């Protein structure tokens, strides 16, 4: 027994690539496509909910993950890959930040714990790298709206809007015509769908699609009340009849 | 590729036997043992004329009553010195006794075959087989005079007189004539020092070959250039005398 | 090189084969199995099929007791059904000792998927070539089925089938809910659920069954247990009782 | 084929061998001869002991184990060093834990165990020798054979290393004379020795040259090399 | 408290002749006011010629004879039966008492 | 955890780790030392690869261990590093333990004990360096100068050479240096040695490093100019015919 | 205790050390030094339970050396005395602390200026003018406080140490056999050979 | 066994070279290029970011000039995210330096540590050597002004103005080229950006494509200042020095 | 591609794992062994292959008790099946110790399962080189069993593996059709010296030892016990007589 591959499974090849970093890259390539636009006053990420069957029932799979209350995460390549990273995300925003600050971490500092954890399946023996992109919005105090994406290398690089997966290219092409420094966040939502249109085949409805937005603070979501510096969560994740309403002015 | 401690279809480990190899490559080594003692000789052979002859270290002392040379891929025998020494000590520290001369032998054969990637047995850390093999020498109360020839291979066989190194089949076969119950240790001595000549590629002189042994008198003693240098010119006059 | 297929690292195409064969092996049994959900329990399906003679058909099953309220069904190999079994009981157990309270069955599943997840990264362990379908009627979410993947994933289902002709049945199933509208059996007793769900076993498969062809497991508020060979004969007369 | 199954012991080949198992027990083969035969009074021990050159001594082959047990070698020497120690502590054990001396049949299982071990697991490999325990216990004279592929068993004689079959043979036809030599030790030793010169085929037994061990009802294991092997040549 | 020690009582004498040497003790062994046994050897024949007691604490005065009873065993298995010199067995047993320097042999010992 | 016995034999009897490693000394920049009856000289050239450096900063060839002991070598720098880090740790350790500082033998054996291990221990890679050690040993006027490999072998040398074109200044050592009568000067030891390399280095005035060794820690390096006459004192030594 | 006293003048720091060494009912040695030179410009004195003492001072002079010869550079006083802290600090929570208190003396080339540094064993250091370790600050201190000027001259303050030392002399109740005097300047550590009778 | 899948990282060729670090240097050649320049008065830093899009964020940007120290940073070329590893642990050694003498630790010190750490992976744990190089741009009172250079082999240099990434060799030959020990700060802003503008493999240099760092001693103070260069100043310098 | 068939823990395309299957080799290449379960006990036996005259007759003992109510035996590298019962032995001391009651049969079952299944997890391990037939008596009833090197395992009717396993398992049919009622145990033994008999004609040409042991609720009470004596003669002779 005893795991004995204490050596790196991804290593350099004479040209100079790393194998395995780029293969991931090749599974992050076939999976769905999924996006994020910043607005002036919120971030929007958005994907397709690909159910795999008629009989799965897509709301019990969530593609877009909380991390925190005015953080979120959504991706494109293996879903398994993305929620065991979206676990040790979580973990990590508490263990290295809230445990420590009484506070939670600022977007860039998370995406930057995220990335490392990234790296390291990247170097560390006996593993392979995570096969998935992953394209995380947030808020914070001092940086204001954010969105950054994460590959598996590790690397990771703030957009105003972006798109990975299947149609990445078609629909970043979309995005840099309809975007602007000026737009609110329903801008953003409707830009979204409509990017996220041209890459649905079948059914495109809030039922097939997943969104959230980090904008506002819910104080209806709080759960508490007689705390004035306690506000509630920016993050928000649409609802299926929220989703439908925006697709008539469609 | 192939474990480091991997059987041969043959029943013999590779290692074991490629580490054999280099030991061939060795400077040659002879120790005769006789009643009176035993001689150890071994061939400097130095690389260069600018490497001073004197710094080649190819016989020590285990105790004062055991010694030893070596042959072959020659720093890989300085851990086994160490453990030699301290073995011997650490008996002496215990028992208030000398360690016999088969038992210090045994206990440097035992790291023998300590080697491996994880050998299920106990924590033998050490990647391959030392690449040399040695001529214990050294006597004791029970058993007198003794020579002992230890391989990477954990065991060790008592000889009479035994060569190893490069010319050791050729040395070997001549100690096999020239060896009798009854030689004294000047003879010991000449025959060592002729048989180097024999199969040492340069001209034997007290610079490139040492020699040395071990008396229940005096014990392990390193014979000084000046020492041996004479013991030559005994050689040469006797075999030009037929 | 070509050693990207013996360990879980990617191929050249971004796959994972060790994964894909592992996937292979859950359907070295030949058997299939279905799930459904009633309008309080959930009902589990799965073929018998004990060809030697000499064997001891009341110890031959996939269907296992994880905990007093989940249930478990296996597609694969034995030995690794029963090493996910082993771990799945472990893990329900712990659950309860530590946070007060019995794991629910999705939660179950996640854990599992994730245990997956994990052979799929690390080179020294190997995928585990099963699909666990977990069943129970959880206290907060009502009947649930989730099932897991060698791949390390889970979702839940309103129905689902498993084995050599899940898609014969999986289409019927789909065939029947398109019909009825609803996300489940609209049943009172779990008995009918189970006829039901032998029924379309039977119509997808265009098979008949006798007591000793079948394995029945069933999940109601607070308990989940498997029917025994009379319990089955009673639901397989009451069904014929129609046709 | 044999050369894709036969890097490791932890490696099953297409027809369910272990080659690397098979390889050591090649190194007993190539091992100088050795017999052991049994009457019910006592156990003996003869081994032909091998030299390098004539300048050299004949590697001792009878590791005696403690008073009432002990064992003969052939094979990679240092593997029996290690599994006589083993031997050795596990008789001490019995001594100092139970006040019990270990019974014979007990330490075979204790060997076999330990040797298979060394055949499941990756990075180590098998033992390279082949063990013949002898011992005198409380159910009476006893004699084991020891493989490295970890097969122990109990015998009234045999022999293993080079040449083996011929003394096995002899052995084998000796039977019903030798296991009745109770109460006579050199009787039981002559035909040891009797059965080991129908192994030779280099050269005759000498006195620097033949091993003999015995142990039994009044007897501890003693060794007797050289001179003391004299009046049996 | 739990106290690890005990007095077993006893007497033991040594005395070294020209070419012979004795090894006496008592054979009553004690507790307290009451006596545990009116014969229980404390003097003990080692083998290599070599006698021995360890008197005090009887439990350690055992453990200890027995640890070097074992040593003698196996100092012939890795020294080729050799006799154990009785300046040899002396210096080997101060190893075996200040090993447990920290916790030691409540016993005064002999040979 | 790893531990990959990267260090074999193979069946000729070669461990070529340890002999490809000497490949790497073979490529390193020369180096060469020689003991005149006062003193050691220690000379080292250098690359020309890329020329804009920072001689100031960028890391000498030469190191001192510990007051009266110096370290130079040829192969890879950042192995050369972890030796010589070792090394002056361990000559701090002895001072510490013994009341008095290493002798050069003894931090030499140090230094090559730490390269064969190096060489037979699981998960790491020989030393792809060579080093020359020289110095006084305590309270002592006799020069010592030695020589190390990554076999772990070692010695003493009157005077020796490793790196690039070694073979080619070891042979202009054998027939300019006489054990008779060594460099009885400061003066005509650091010239031999200048000479040695200049068979190698190509008119290098910036090429060419030189640190003298004597007595009582007494250790300095030599600048541009100074090595540069002597250079060209030498260039007309052969002109002058 | 013994005997540590340390006082910083305009361009030199000296150090004051008793000779003395009592173990129980006997004064084994009255030559003893209680100091080590950590690098040319810098000199430690310390007094403490009887092993640590020097264990440690000879533990911090080979850390020192083995960073200048690293290095080819001197550590400046203010950089010794942080390490040393640090190290005692590190003690004061381990199994069995270092019982030691020091007083570093150094001149710093950089700044061109003597400084003296007081470290407990407990890692509590400050930079004085002058300043002792157990009961000498007691006797001495008024005596410091009175005549100290931060302009004296080496020569002002061996004088001042010496009357410093007879205070000692007369009211500690302990012979501690005279100190041994050391000065640390821009050229290095000496020795006053002279202070039995100055 | 595993052995059979042990690519081997730390051993040499039959040539006496590590394949690992030969193939990461490899990697580092296609990196974006990064130049530092040591001035009289002061270092420049440059970089050229490797690919961009009109909806990449640059003000938030940096993925190639980062902070150790108050008086370090360190130019990247190689795997970011390697980079960011080793970055970190630097910065830890350098506070650890600050605690224990309390002075900033000397460049030198903190570049033969992460140099020394590079090594490591060379020798030893069977591990892919970081496919990264660095340029170091820092200043203490023992040197002043520094600019040093570290390898995935575990090397490290002093340059008066060098260069890592893409097309070092048309770099090193300009900047060889240009230089001039009584250089200024300002001299060398401009020799860095023309450098990089003439071995830049885009149409043009614009300033979303830069980044840039230089460390002073304004003169109005008597301390060392670090000044990583927002967008704007890019921009602004850009036109500036005539390339608009 | 191929090579599937050299690391233990590998999927091959198929879904197999011949390491496994390969094992399986090694225990079809064994003497054969059986078990019969009896209305109120088990019975074990098997073959013992007489090599020579050499052996000492009924001393190499193959059946292994477990506990004091569990018999064990099996077919394939013998080495391998002590190896499975020392387990075996500690797995069962470890349920005593907790739970007081010695361990059910079925629990048992699973322990040496999962044990197994245990080694065909990693390529760091080999596969079990044995099948196992072991049951015994407990809180209700009588339990027969056989683990595989996969192992896989079930309750059985009788049991059968080695040389002459389909032999065996044809006899063990013919019984289980003409007695539903259930066999006794005194009749099982004599059932099963035949069974041996019978299947030792796949090796009809060595001379062998026959070796059966029993558990028995009425006829040993529960415990496992060896037949020997009259009882074993008499199981001989009902053999040697229907073998003719």
């Not at chain 4, 032909?48 to 052939?74: F, T, V």
């Not at chain 7, 950089?110 to 002792?132: F, H, M, R, S, W």
């Not at chain 9, 060595?206 to 060896?226: A, P, Q």
């Amino acid at each position: 027994m005893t795991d004995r591959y204490s050596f790196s499974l991804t290593t350099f090849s004479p040209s100079g690539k790393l194998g395995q970093i780029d293969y991931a890259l090749t599974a992050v390539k076939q999976g769905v496509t999924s996006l994020g636009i910043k607005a002036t006053n919120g971030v929007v990420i958005a994907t397709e909910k690909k159910s795999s069957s008629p009989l799965a029932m897509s709301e019990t799979l969530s593609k877009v993950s909380l991390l925190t209350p005015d953080i979120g995460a959504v991706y494109s390549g293996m879903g398994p890959d993305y929620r065991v990273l979206v676990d040790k995300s979580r973990k990590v925003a508490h263990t290295s930040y809230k445990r420590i600050y009484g506070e939670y971490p600022p977007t860039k500092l998370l995406v930057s714990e995220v990335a490392k954890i990234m790296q390291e399946a990247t170097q560390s023996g006996g593993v392979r790298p995570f096969g998935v992109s992953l394209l995380i919005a947030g808020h914070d105090e001092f940086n204001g709206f954010s969105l950054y994406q994460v590959d598996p290398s590790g690397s990771y690089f703030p957009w105003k809007a972006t798109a990975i997966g299947k149609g990445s290219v078609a629909a970043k092409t979309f995005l840099e015509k309809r975007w602007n420094d000026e737009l609110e966040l329903e801008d953003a939502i409707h830009i979204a769908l409509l990017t996220l249109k041209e890459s649905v085949e079948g059914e495109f409805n809030g039922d097939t699609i997943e969104l959230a937005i980090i904008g506002d603070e819910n104080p209806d979501l709080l759960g508490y009340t007689g705390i004035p510096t306690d506000k509630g969560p920016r993050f928000r994740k649409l609802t299926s009849q929220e989703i439908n309403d925006r697709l008539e002015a469609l | 590729d192939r474990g480091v401690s991997t059987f041969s279809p043959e029943g013999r480990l590779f290692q074991v036997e490629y580490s054999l190899e280099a030991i061939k490559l060795g400077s040659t080594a002879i120790g005769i043992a006789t009643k009176e003692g035993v001689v150890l000789g071994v061939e400097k052979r130095a690389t260069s004329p600018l490497l001073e002859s004197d710094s080649i270290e190819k016989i020590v002392e285990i105790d004062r009553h055991i010694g030893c040379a070596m042959s072959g891929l020659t720093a890989d025998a300085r851990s086994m010195i160490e453990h030699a020494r301290t073995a011997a000590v650490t008996h002496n520290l215990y028992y208030d006794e000398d360690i016999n001369v088969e038992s210090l032998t045994q206990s440097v054969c035992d790291l023998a075959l300590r080697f491996g990637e994880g050998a299920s047995g106990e924590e033998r850390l050490m990647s391959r087989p030392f690449g040399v093999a040695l001529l214990i020498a050294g006597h004791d109360a029970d058993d007198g005079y003794q020579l002992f020839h230890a391989e990477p291979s954990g065991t060790f066989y008592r000889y009479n007189a035994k060569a190893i190194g490069s010319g050791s089949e050729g040395a070997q076969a001549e100690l096999l004539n020239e060896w009798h119950s009854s030689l004294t240790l000047k003879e010991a001595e000449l025959l060592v020092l002729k048989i180097l000549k024999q199969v040492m590629e340069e001209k034997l002189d007290e610079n490139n070959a040492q020699l040395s042994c071990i008396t229940k008198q005096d014990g392990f003693k390193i014979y000084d250039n000046e020492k041996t240098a004479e013991l030559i010119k005994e050689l040469k006059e006797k075999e030009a005398a037929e | 090189a070509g050693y990207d297929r013996h360990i879980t690292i990617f191929s050249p195409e971004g796959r994972l084969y060790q994964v894909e064969y592992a996937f292979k092996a859950t359907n070295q049994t030949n058997i299939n199995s279905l799930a459904v959900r009633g309008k309080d329990c959930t009902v589990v399906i799965s073929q018998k099929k004990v060809p030697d003679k000499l064997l001891d058909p009341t110890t031959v099953s996939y269907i296992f007791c994880i905990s007093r309220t989940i249930g478990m069904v296996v597609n694969g190999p034995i030995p690794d059904a029963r090493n996910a079994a082993l771990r799945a009981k472990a893990e329900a157990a712990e659950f309860r000792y530590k946070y007060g309270y019995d794991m629910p069955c999705d939660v179950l599943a996640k854990r599992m998927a994730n245990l997956s997840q994990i052979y799929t990264q690390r080179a020294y362990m190997r995928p585990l070539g099963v699909i666990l379908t977990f069943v129970s009627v959880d206290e907060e979410l009502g009947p649930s089925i989730y099932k897991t993947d060698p791949a390390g994933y889970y979702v839940g289902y309103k129905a689902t089938a498993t084995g050599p002709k899940q898609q014969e049945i999986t289409t019927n199933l789909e065939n029947h809910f398109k019909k009825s509208k609803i996300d489940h059996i609209n049943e009172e007793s779990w008995e009918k659920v189970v006829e039901f769900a032998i029924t379309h076993m039977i119509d997808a498969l265009g098979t008949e069954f006798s007591k000793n062809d079948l394995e029945v497991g069933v999940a109601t508020k607070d308990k989940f247990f498997t029917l025994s060979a009379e319990n089955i004969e009673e639901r397989l007369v009451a069904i014929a009782e129609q046709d | 084929f044999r050369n894709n199954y036969d890097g490791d012991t932890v490696t099953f080949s297409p027809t369910g061998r272990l080659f690397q198992v098979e390889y050591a027990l090649e190194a007993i083969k190539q091992g100088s001869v050795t017999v052991g035969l049994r009457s019910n009074t006592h156990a003996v021990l003869v081994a032909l002991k091998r030299n390098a050159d004539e300048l050299s001594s004949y590697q001792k082959k009878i590791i005696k184990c403690d008073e009432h047990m002990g064992l003969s070698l052939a094979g990679l020497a240092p593997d029996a060093r290690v599994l006589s120690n083993y031997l050795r502590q596990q008789c001490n054990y019995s001594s100092l834990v139970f006040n019990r001396k270990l019974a014979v049949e007990r330490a075979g299982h204790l060997l076999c165990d330990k040797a298979q071990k060394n055949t499941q697991s990756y990075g180590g490999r098998p033992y390279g020798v082949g063990l013949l325990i002898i011992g005198y216990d409380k159910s009476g004279a006893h004699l084991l054979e020891f493989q490295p592929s970890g097969n122990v068993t109990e015998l009234y004689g045999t022999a293993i290393g080079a040449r083996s079959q011929g003394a096995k043979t002899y052995l084998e036809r000796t039977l019903d004379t030798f296991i009745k030599i109770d109460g006579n030790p050199d009787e039981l030793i002559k035909a040891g020795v009797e059965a080991i010169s129908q192994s030779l085929r280099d050269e005759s037994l000498t006195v620097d040259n033949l091993s003999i061990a015995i142990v039994g009802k009044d007897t501890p294991f003693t060794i007797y090399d050289g001179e003391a092997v004299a009046k049996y040549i | 408290q739990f106290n690890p020690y005990g007095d077993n009582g006893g007497t033991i004498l040594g005395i070294a002749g020209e070419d012979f040497a004795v090894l006496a003790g008592d054979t009553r062994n004690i507790t307290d006011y009451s006596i545990n046994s009116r014969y229980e050897p404390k003097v003990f024949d080692c083998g290599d010629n070599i006698v021995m007691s360890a008197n005090g604490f009887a439990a350690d005065g055992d453990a200890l004879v027995k640890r070097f009873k074992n040593s003698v065993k196996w100092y012939h298995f890795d020294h080729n039966d050799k006799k154990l010199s009785i300046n040899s067995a002396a210096r080997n047993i101060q190893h075996l008492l200040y090993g447990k320097r920290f916790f030691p042999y409540y016993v005064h010992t002999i040979i | 955890g790893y531990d990959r016995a990267l260090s074999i034999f193979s069946p000729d009897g070669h461990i070529f780790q340890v002999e490809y490693a000497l490949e790497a000394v073979k490529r390193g920049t020369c180096a060469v030392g020689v003991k005149g009856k006062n003193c050691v000289v220690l000379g080292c050239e250098r690359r020309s690869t890329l020329k804009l450096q920072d001689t100031r900063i960028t890391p000498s060839k030469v190191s001192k261990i510990d007051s009266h002991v110096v370290l130079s070598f040829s192969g890879l720098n950042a192995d050369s590093r972890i030796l010589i880090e070792k090394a002056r740790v361990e000559a701090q350790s002895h001072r510490l333990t013994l009341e008095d500082p290493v002798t050069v033998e003894y931090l030499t054996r140090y230094v090559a004990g730490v390269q064969q291990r190096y060489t037979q221990s699981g998960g790491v890679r020989p030393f792809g360096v060579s080093t020359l050690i020289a110095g006084f040993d305590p309270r002592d006027d006799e020069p010592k100068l030695y020589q190390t490999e990554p076999s772990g072998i070692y010695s003493s040398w009157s005077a020796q050479t490793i790196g690039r074109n070694s073979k080619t200044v070891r042979e202009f050592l054998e027939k300019n240096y006489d054990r008779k009568e060594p460099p009885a000067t400061v003066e005509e030891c650091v010239k031999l040695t200048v000479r040695s390399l200049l068979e190698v280095v190509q008119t290098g005035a910036k090429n060419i490093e030189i640190t003298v060794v004597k007595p009582d820690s007494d250790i300095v390096a030599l600048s541009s100019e100074e090595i540069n006459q002597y250079v060209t004192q030498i260039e007309q030594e052969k002109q002058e015919q | 205790m013994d005997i540590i006293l340390g006082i910083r003048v305009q361009d030199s720091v000296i150090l004051a050390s008793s000779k003395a060494v009592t173990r129980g009912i006997s004064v084994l040695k009255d030559s003893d030094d209680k100091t080590r030179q950590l690098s040319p410009h810098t000199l430690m004195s310390f007094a403490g339970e009887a092993g640590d003492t020097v264990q440690f001072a000879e533990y911090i002079q080979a850390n020192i050396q083995l960073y200048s010869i690293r290095e080819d550079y001197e550590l400046s006083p203010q950089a010794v005395s942080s390490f040393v802290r640090q190290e005692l600090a590190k003690s004061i929570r381990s199994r069995r602390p270092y019982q030691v208190n020091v007083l570093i003396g150094g001149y710093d080339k950089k700044k061109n200026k003597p400084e003296l540094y007081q470290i407990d064993y407990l890692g509590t250091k400050v930079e004085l003018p002058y300043g002792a370790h157990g009961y000498s600050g007691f006797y001495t201190f008024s005596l410091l406080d009175h005549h100290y000027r931060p302009d004296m001259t080496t020569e002002e303050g061996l004088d001042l140490l010496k009357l410093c030392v007879q205070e000692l002399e007369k009211r500690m109740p302990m012979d501690f056999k005279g100190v041994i005097v050391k000065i640390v300047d821009k050229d290095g550590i000496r020795q006053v050979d002279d202070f039995q009778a100055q | 066994g595993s052995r059979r899948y042990d690519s081997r990282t730390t051993i040499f060729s039959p040539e006496g070279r590590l394949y690992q670090v030969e193939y990461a240097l490899e990697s580092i050649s296609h990196a974006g290029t990064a130049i530092g320049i040591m001035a009289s008065d002061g270092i420049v830093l440059a970089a050229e970011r490797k690919v961009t899009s009109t909806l990449l964020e640059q003000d938030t940007s940096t993925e190639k000039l980062y902070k150790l120290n108050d008086k370090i940073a360190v130019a990247v070329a190689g795997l970011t995210a390697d980079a960011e590893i080793l970055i970190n642990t630097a910065r830890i050694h350098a506070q650890n330096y600050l605690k224990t003498y309390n002075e900033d630790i000397p460049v030198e010190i903190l570049v033969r540590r992460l140099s020394d750490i590079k090594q490591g992976y060379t020798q030893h744990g069977g591990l892919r050597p970081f496919g990264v190089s660095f340029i170091y741009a820092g200043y203490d009172d023992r040197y002043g002004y520094q600019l040093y250079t570290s390898n995935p082999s575990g090397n490290y240099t002093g340059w008066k103005a060098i260069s890592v990434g893409a097309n070092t060799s048309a770099a090193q030959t300009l900047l060889q080229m240009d230089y001039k020990d009584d250089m200024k700060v300002d001299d060398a802003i401009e020799l860095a950006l023309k450098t990089l503008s003439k071995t830049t493999d885009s149409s043009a240099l614009t300033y979303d494509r830069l980044e840039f760092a230089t460390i002073r001693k304004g003169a109005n103070d008597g301390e060392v200042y670090q000044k990583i260069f927002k967008p704007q100043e890019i921009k602004d310098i850009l036109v500036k020095t005539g390339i608009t | 591609g191929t090579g599937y068939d050299l690391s233990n823990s590998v999927f091959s395309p198929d879904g197999r794992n011949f390491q496994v299957e390969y094992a399986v080799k090694a225990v079809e290449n064994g003497t054969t062994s059986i078990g019969i379960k009896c209305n109120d006990g088990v019975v074990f036996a098997v073959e013992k292959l007489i090599t020579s005259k050499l052996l000492v007759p009924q001393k190499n003992v193959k059946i292994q008790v477990v506990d004091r109510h569990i018999g064990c035996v099996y077919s394939g590298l013998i080495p391998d099946g002590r190896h499975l019962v020392n387990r075996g032995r500690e797995e069962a001391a470890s349920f005593k110790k907790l739970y007081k009651t010695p361990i059910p049969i079925p629990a048992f079952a699973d322990r040496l399962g999962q044990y197994v299944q245990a080694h065909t997890l990693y390529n760091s391990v080999r596969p079990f080189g044995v099948s196992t037939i072991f049951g015994g008596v407990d809180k209700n009833g009588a339990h027969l069993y056989m683990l595989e090197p996969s192992g896989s395992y079930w309750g059985y009717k009788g049991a059968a593996t080695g040389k002459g396993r389909q032999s065996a398992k044809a006899e063990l049919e013919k019984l289980v059709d003409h007695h539903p009622e259930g066999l006794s145990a005194r009749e099982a033994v004599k059932q099963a010296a035949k069974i041996i008999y019978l299947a030792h004609e796949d090796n009809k040409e060595k001379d062998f030892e026959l070796e059966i042991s029993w558990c028995s609720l009425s006829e040993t009470n529960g415990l496992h016990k060896f037949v020997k004596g009259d009882l074993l003669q008499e199981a001989i002779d009902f053999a040697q007589k229907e073998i003719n």
